[PDB]
Structure 1
Amino acid sequence: VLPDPIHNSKLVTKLINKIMLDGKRGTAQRILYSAFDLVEQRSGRDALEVFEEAINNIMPVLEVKARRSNYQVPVEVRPERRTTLGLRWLVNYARLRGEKTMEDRLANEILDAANNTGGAVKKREDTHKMAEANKAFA
């Protein structure tokens, strides 16, 4: 695929195509751009910088596979599934960060993740917690 017009990044477009509902790329585009505007408003610095820091935080490094009773055995996450899960959890836990507008939701989610807080980081550490707990089965 390609990078985005305003910022020239692959991840932004890959994230638009995951926020997008029913192929409303422009709606998703609007709300993500306004979120970058609003996270430049609050916590004044570059939207890409804060965003990339956010995904560096929440993007995990381990995973589990459920097999057999049912063991759940750890495994090293692929570097593509890394960004995949990061962006997915970012969007979803934004959507359930529960306030008025999704741009505000997203802004707060990237903000909290940038400061290593937020539901996405919670899921990350849950994942690693259950992984190391199940480390015996590797």
Structure 2
Amino acid sequence: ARRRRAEVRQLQPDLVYGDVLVTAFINKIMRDGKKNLAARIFYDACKIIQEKTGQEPLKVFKQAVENVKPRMEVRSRRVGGANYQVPMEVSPRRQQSLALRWLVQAANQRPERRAAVRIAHELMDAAEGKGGAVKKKEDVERMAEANRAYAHYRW
């Protein structure tokens, strides 16, 4: 990105909830370009959301996502000395992606024998503010800011 600024790709909306914050999540669940696997994982995960709580999955999903995105992170920088962890804002498009990513990674940490169940339980636990994923969010934000001392590089 020396030259232009690069636009975010506008991904085709969902087939079941019509939401683009979903195919977003579905792409991140995907691997080796097998999209059908990914959908079958996620929509299944939605069916397990519906079982273990009366709530519509789409409001459960969005709830955990909002609950995961950080308001601060650190980014190494230097002039001399050593790499100074500089605290700074997390510009909305990135909160979006950091949340989606961590969610999936966290999901695949779980002991749950199959995916979907992993995704469901991770999607659920995160709505309740618990469950590692929010670990990252909090342990990011907490670890950032704790370098307040070096926040004088606003940008």
TM category, shorter: over 0.9
CA distance in 2, matches of 1:133, 1:60: 14
The equivalent residue for 1:49 is: 59
The equivalent residue for 1:34 is: 44
Which residue identity is paired with 2:141? Answer: H
Which residue identity is paired with 1:111? Answer: M
Greater than 3 Å deviation, 4+ residue runs:
none
**C-alpha deviation, 1:17, in angstroms:** 1.0
Q: TM-score when scaled to structure 2?
A: 0.87
* 1:119 paired residue among 132, 135, 141: 132
CA distance in 2, matches of 1:112, 1:85: 17
The equivalent residue for 2:23 is: 13
What are the residue-to-residue correspondences of 1:1-138 with 2, within 5 Å? 1-68=11-78, 69-138=82-151
CA distance in 2, matches of 1:132, 1:62: 7
CA distance in 1, matches of 2:110, 2:58: 21
CA distance in 1, matches of 2:36, 2:120: 18
5+ residue gaps in structure 1?
none
Aligned residues: 138
CA distance in 2, matches of 1:113, 1:99: 16
Question: What is the RMSD computed on CA atoms of the aligned residues?
Answer: 0.8
Q: TM-score when scaled to structure 1?
A: 0.97
Name the stretch that deviates more: 63-72 or 83-92. Answer: 63-72
**C-alpha deviation, 1:74, in angstroms:** 0.6
CA distance in 1, matches of 2:117, 2:69: 21
Residue deviations 1:80-117 (CA, integer Å, cap 9, x gap): 11110001000001101122111011101111110000
**C-alpha deviation, 1:63, in angstroms:** 1.3
**C-alpha deviation, 1:8, in angstroms:** 0.7
**Residue 75 of structure 1 aligns to a residue in which SS?**
strand
Larger Rg: 2
Give identity over the alignment, percent: 49
Which residue identity is paired with 2:146? Answer: A
